[PDB]
Amino acid sequence: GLEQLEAQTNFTKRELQVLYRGFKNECPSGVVNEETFKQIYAQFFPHGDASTYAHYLFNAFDTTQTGSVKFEDFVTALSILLRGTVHEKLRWTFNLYDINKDGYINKEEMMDIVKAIYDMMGKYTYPVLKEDTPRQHVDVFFQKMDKNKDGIVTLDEFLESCQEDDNIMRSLQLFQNVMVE
Ligand SMILES: [Ca+2]
Ligand SMILES: [Ca+2]
């Protein structure tokens, strides 16, 4: 299904082969489980514990929710993360934070993800994420993004906030980018 795969992503046929080669190179069995994913991701952050964030990142890749990320799942997410539009990329990130796939983000979900990011960055969570604690960042995040103040952040509130603030966007995307470097 390389032809079906090429039609659905931003990659050519020969780029897909270069991607497959690298995929098997790192995943001999042809599929990636959580641990393998956590191992690979861990390296992007040696000064912290990125396993919990890598956990959320894994599920977002595992769209079929099979606990096993196939090559197409991998390319499908890369197609977006690597060469998707800001709109497409932000939607991917919103979906990552929307853990229960409510269609919305609550403070509890925000906390989980953000607590994962702080642990990942360790004590070197530079201005990327100011504020001493995750709880303090989450409250400042929601205040700015939850425009109608109903304690919920919808996709639209999320996009508008990001569109009107280069800072909010980075604190969200930064971690998705490290992978498409
Ligand atoms: Ca939700
Ligand atoms: Ca709201």
UniProtKB/Swiss-Prot annotation:
Membrane topology: Peripheral membrane protein
Residues that bind Ca(2+) 1: 98, 100, 102, 104, 109
Species of the source: Homo sapiens (Human)
UniProt main location, coarse: membrane
Residues of the EF-hand domain: 1-46, 49-84, 85-120, 133-168
Residue segments, region Interaction with KCND2: 166-179
Listed transmembrane segments: none
Gene: KCNIP1
Binding site for Ca(2+) 2: 146, 148, 150, 157
Highest taxon in the source lineage: Eukaryota
Family under the similarity heading: Belongs to the recoverin family.
A GO BP entry: regulation of potassium ion transmembrane transport
GO cellular component: cytoplasm; cytoplasmic side of plasma membrane; dendrite; Kv4.3-KChIP1 channel complex; plasma membrane; synapse; voltage-gated potassium channel complex
Annotated tissue distribution: Isoform 1 and isoform 2 are expressed in brain and kidney. Isoform 1 is also expressed in liver, pancreas, skeletal muscle, small intestine and testis. Isoform 2 is also expressed in lung, pancreas, leukocytes, prostate and thymus.
Interval of the full protein contained in this chain: 49 to 227 of 227
Subcellular location: Cell membrane; Cytoplasm; Cell projection, Dendrite
Subunit architecture: Component of heteromultimeric potassium channels. Identified in potassium channel complexes containing KCND1, KCND2, KCND3, KCNIP1, KCNIP2, KCNIP3, KCNIP4, DPP6 and DPP10. Part of a heterooctamer composed of the tetrameric channel and four KCNIP1 chains. Probably part of a complex consisting of KCNIP1, KCNIP2 isoform 3 and KCND2. Self-associates to form homodimers and homotetramers. Interacts with KCNIP2 isoform 3 in a calcium-dependent manner. Interacts with Naja atra venom CTX3.
Name of the protein described by the UniProt record: A-type potassium channel modulatory protein KCNIP1
Role noted for this protein: Regulatory subunit of Kv4/D (Shal)-type voltage-gated rapidly inactivating A-type potassium channels. Regulates channel density, inactivation kinetics and rate of recovery from inactivation in a calcium-dependent and isoform-specific manner. In vitro, modulates KCND1/Kv4.1 and KCND2/Kv4.2 currents. Increases the presence of KCND2 at the cell surface.
